[PDB]
Amino acid sequence: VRSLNCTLRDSQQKSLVMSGPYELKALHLQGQDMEQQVVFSMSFVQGEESNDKIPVALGLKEKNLYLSCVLKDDKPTLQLESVDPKNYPKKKMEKRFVFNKIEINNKLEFESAQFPNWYISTSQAENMPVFLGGTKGGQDITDFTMQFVSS
Predict the structure, then answer these.
(1) Phi, psi of 110 (to 5 degrees)
(2) 96: which DSSP letter?
(3) N or C: which end of the chain has fewer CB atoms below 10 A?
(4) HSE-CB of 127 using CA atoms within 13 angstroms
(5) What distance in Å separates the CA atoms of residue 20 and residue 18, rounded to the nearest whole number?
(6) Longest Cα–Cα distance in the chain
(7) What is the DSSP letter of 141?
(8) Which CATH class is domain 1-151?
């Protein structure tokens, strides 16, 4: 299935890192300290596609760990999910692992296919977790740049 390696940075130039075994944190990184930043494998999966909207999965480079969207206290929640490493990645990923990648003026948004109008968001502050957020509007950050890596 077509995959691209990539890092993500938020519109404020916070870089993404592994907090716990299962959280991402966003933080202002520079220098060699930049090593510490998480590389995704982004997969082109089966879904509703427009020029403007592309369904992707977001895995970590050589870990069987995928971002999924799941209900946790009657709230959409973002988690890192362990998968069977022989069975993944797939073209037909399960709906919780699917994001619509949306290009909206050199920036990306990642909408959950599973919770419409829920986006991968970061905090304005340092060292807070990446979350599923439902409110686009000058508060939490919902847009990203993408960098390719010579994988």
Answers:
(1) -115, 100
(2) G
(3) C
(4) 0
(5) 6
(6) 41
(7) B
(8) mainly beta
The number of residues making up the chain comes to 151
Helix (H) or strand (E) holding 70: strand 65-71
Residues of the chain with a following break (C to N over 2.5 Å):
none
Strand partners, 137: none
The token duo for 108 is: 């990306």
Please state the domain extents for the chain: 1-151
Q: What are phi and psi of 68, to 5 degrees?
A: -130, 155
Resolution (Å) of this entry: 2.0
Residue 39 token pair: 């590389």
The pair of structure tokens assigned to 34 is 């930049």
> Measured between alpha carbons, how far is 139 from 19 in angstroms, rounded to an integer?
22
